[PDB]
Amino acid sequence: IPEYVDWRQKGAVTPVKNQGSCGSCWAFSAVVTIEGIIKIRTGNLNEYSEQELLDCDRRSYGCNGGYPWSALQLVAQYGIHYRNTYPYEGVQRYCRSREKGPYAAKTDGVRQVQPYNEGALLYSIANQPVSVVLEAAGKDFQLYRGGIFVGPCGNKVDHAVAAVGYGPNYILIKNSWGTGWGENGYIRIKRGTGNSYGVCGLYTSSFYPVKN
Ligand SMILES: *C(C(=O)O)[C@H](O)C(=O)N[C@@H](CC(C)C)C(=O)NCCCCNC(N)=[NH2+]
């Protein structure tokens, strides 16, 4: 795998979103990975519906949090609508996949990166954007403005984001806090520290969609 990956440059990453007060980070991360894998496989960059996953992923808990693996398995089992057909409202509602016509895209499954393994996660990112989790509760992360973030932070992961690239010393993360946080909505998180958990627990739980 190459020294640098940046899925924004390959045209596989949509604009940065803002989840608002809703605890829907798991849905944004999953959606980032769906938009990415659809561009990689089909050549088209589309925006997909975080709201659909928020409403319809029964394994998850709506705005009270959820599981990126459940959302990705939801898109593989049924599918997902375009963001425009099923836009984001910032509150959980009734599942409306059934009334919004056929699904816009569908994947074929969901694989997990071997946890606590930096190289395994890098291998994943070189193939597609990957859904990852991290500890975002610390004020240090909340106030991040730029640079290679090294913490301080623990490993008590609580926030789902998306890894969309990496470099020799960092992993590039698309957050869902709007374009005004961090590096235009992104954070570069230090890697290579030898902490098996990753900075802010970044290696705790990583999933990516599969598309034949
Ligand atoms: C994301 C956010 O807005 O920060 C949101 O809180 C979330 O999905 N949190 C996850 C943790 C990450 C995915 C690691 C979470 O808490 N998942 C477990 C389910 C939600 C909490 N439990 C219940 N019953 N609601």
Say what the resolution is, in angstroms: 2.8
Catalytic site residue from 22, 153, 159, 200: 159
* Solving technique: electron diffraction
DSSP code per residue over 91-108: S-----GGGS-S-SB---
Number of domains in the chain: 1
Phi, psi of 13 (to 5 degrees): -130, 125
**Residue 60 Cα: closest atom of ligand 1:** 19
CA atoms of 44 and 79, how far apart (whole Å): 16
Q: Which residues contact 55 (CB under 8 A, 6 or more apart)?
A: 62, 92, 93, 94, 95, 96, 97
Q: How far is the CA of 170 from the centre of ligand 1 (A)?
A: 25
Establish whether 200 is a catalytic residue: no
CATH number at 24 reads: 3.90.70.10
Q: Which domain holds residue 14?
A: 1-212
159 is annotated as an active-site residue: yes
DSSP 111-165: EEPPSS-HHHHHHHHHHS-EEEEE---SHHHHT--SSEE--S--S---EEEEEEE
**Tokens matching residue 3:** 């020294």
Q: Is the CB of 61 under 6 A from ligand 1?
A: yes
Task: State CA 109 to chain mean position distance.
Answer: 16
Sign of CA dihedral 121, 24, 7, 202: negative
CA of 205 to the centre of ligand 1 (A): 12
> Is the backbone of residue 180 left (phi > 0), alpha (psi -120 to 50) or beta?
alpha
The neighbouring-strand residues paired with 160 are 133
User: How far apart, in whole angstroms, are the C-alpha atoms of residue 133 and residue 130?
Assistant: 10
Q: Which ligand 1 atom is nearest residue 68's CA? A: 13
Annotated catalytic residue 184: no
Q: Would the annotation count 56 as a binding residue? A: no
**90 CB within 6 A, ligand 1:** no
- To 5 degrees, how large is the angle CA 55–CA 71–CA 38? 110
Largest Cα–Cα separation, the chain = 49
